[PDB]
Every structure is written in C-alpha cells, then in structure tokens.
Amino acid sequence: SDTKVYLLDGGSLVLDGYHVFWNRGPGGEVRFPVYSILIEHAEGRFLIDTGYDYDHVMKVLPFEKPIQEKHQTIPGALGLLGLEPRDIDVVVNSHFHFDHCGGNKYFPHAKKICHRSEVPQACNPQPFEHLGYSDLSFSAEAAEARGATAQLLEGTTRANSTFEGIDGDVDLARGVKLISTPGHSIGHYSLLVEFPRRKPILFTIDAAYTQKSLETLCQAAFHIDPVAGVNSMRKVKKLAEDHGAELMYSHDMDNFKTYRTGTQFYGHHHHHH
C-alpha cells in the first residue's frame, strides 16, 4: 500500500487579474483551475478539499463564470477512478472558501478534519469574507449560524458534518503533513505528501495561487492577514527547498495543464527494482 496521489480536476472559475495578483494585476479576466487532492494511503483514502459546487457559484458568484463538466464534480472525478464518495475515509479542508468545500456534502460517512479556527470563521466571518465563506453546505453548524440551512443537502446533520480541529504543523497520516499557512484565511493549510520512493510534493493550495505568486511574494487579494500571507509564502519556499519538494499550485492554469489528473497519478512503483 504505497502512497499515491490523484488530482481530481474540478473545472475552472474566473477572477480579475487584480484578484489573483493583489494590487499588481494586470487587470482583466483570468481563468484558473480548481482541483482536489485524493491520497490513496495505507491508512485509508484521504481527500484534501472538495472543489466548488456549480449551482452555488451560478447562484451566488456567477461573475466567476464556472465551467465544470459532469466528470469534474467530485462524484464524477471519483468515477473516473472507479470510486464513489463512500470510498473516501477522511476529508480534510484547507479552508472553507466555497471553492474548496463545495463537495463536502457527499461525504457524511467520512471523518472531517480542518484547522480549529475555520468552522468558527465560517460561522462568523469578517465582513469582507462573506463571498469566500459563501457555501455552508459542508457544516450544519455553520449553515445554522449563517442563516443558510436552505443550502444543506438532505441528510446533512451536525453529527455527520462535525470537524476535528487541528493546529500547527501536524501529520495527517504517515508521511502526509499538513503545513500551517495562514493569511489567505485564518486557518489555511498547505499539504506536504511524502512517498516511499520519490521526492515529496508540496501543494501550496491557496497560500500561493500560482508559481508567479510564490516567486514574487504577491499573494491573492482574498486574504484576512496579508502579513501572515507573506510569512506563509516564505515558510513554503523554505520548506520546499529543505525537503527538495516539488511545488504544485492551486489556481494556475499554465502549470495545471502539465499536472497529472484523472487516471494519471503520482507515486509510481519501480519496474526493475
């Protein structure tokens, strides 16, 4: 049971270049991918993030012009792998912006994990965080707090949408580490996956939308604390250098086109060793 990582292509959204590169831009529409990270591990199947819900975006953020085919929903992407939501044991959310938790609703059976601060933030966000924390279907508690119980999928209860809260740099499983990278959101996590026979991969998630972002220390305009945001970028750069990790970014179309998705995966076996 060697560690494998499968990227679940979740389609795309659009933001202004001023959203993507805070203050710098240039301005104008930029379309970027959204994906989730499925880890097939000895300890179980872990899904980090769950993309966006198409209907939610069309209702609440239609200016983000979602494109998402049937195979780019979470059930659809899992289907490419001959899996279904019930095959996933643990769901981890990097943060509860709508584009990272829109598929949580399909995983009532799963254990849920997130930073200790994130459910409380979803319940009572800053005034400027309402569009980010706009989809409360991942939490009956948060939906109730926000007056958004109408968003709840039938069958979602407090009992099946409670999160175990974590803090700091901690192990999710053997060789899978959650790296605290606050700034974009109060409890934002990045992800370091180690493999038995290859160098690690550091998924920046929303601590760095693109390669350019991390190079230039220019974060996204969506953030709660930009000082933290930069410090977290430095932390990520240093961690990658230390571990000799390969960096992969959350919302970077040019790089994403070069990433393995669908039935392609990271963590291959040897063939002559």
Q: Where along the sequence are the contacts to its own copies (CB under 8 A)?
A: 16, 18-19, 22-23, 25, 27-28, 126-128, 131, 217-219, 221-227, 230
Q: Which of 53, 99, 135, 252 is labelled catalytic?
A: 99
- In whole angstroms, how far apart are CA 92 and each of 80, 89, 129, 214, 254? 21, 10, 21, 23, 26
> By C-beta, is 18 or 195 nearer to its own copies?
18
> By C-beta, is 206 or 252 nearer to Zn ion?
206
Interatomic CA distance for residues 248 and 115, integer angstroms: 21
- In whole angstroms, how far apart are CA 102 and each of 52, 56, 87? 4, 8, 18
Confirm or deny that 99 is annotated as ligand binding: yes
Q: Is the peptide bond preceding residue 200 cis, with omega within 30 degrees of 0?
A: no
> According to the binding rule CB under 5 A, does residue 19 interact with Zn ion?
no
Interatomic CA distance for residues 62 and 53, integer angstroms: 12
Query: Shortest distance, CB of residue 249 to its own copies, whole angstroms?
Result: 19
Q: Using CB under 5 A, count the residues that bind Zn ion.
A: 3
- Partner in contact with 159, chosen from its own copies, Zn ion, none, beta carbon below 5 to 8 Å by kind: none
> According to the binding rule CB under 5 A, does residue 118 interact with Zn ion?
no
Interatomic CA distance for residues 106 and 57, integer angstroms: 17
Interatomic CA distance for residues 203 and 260, integer angstroms: 13
- Partner in contact with 44, chosen from its own copies, Zn ion, none, beta carbon below 5 to 8 Å by kind: none
Q: Judge whether 102 and 61 are in contact, CB under 8 Å.
A: no
Residues 192-211 touching Zn ion, rule: CB under 5 A, are 206
> By C-beta, is 22 or 195 nearer to its own copies?
22
Let me know if 16 is a catalytic residue. no
Backbone angles phi, psi at 227, to 5 degrees: -70, -50
> According to the binding rule CB under 5 A, does residue 97 interact with Zn ion?
yes
> By C-beta, is 110 or 214 nearer to its own copies?
214
Q: Which amino acids are annotated as binding site for Zn(2+), given as ranges?
A: 95, 97, 99-100, 184, 206, 251
| Active site members | 99
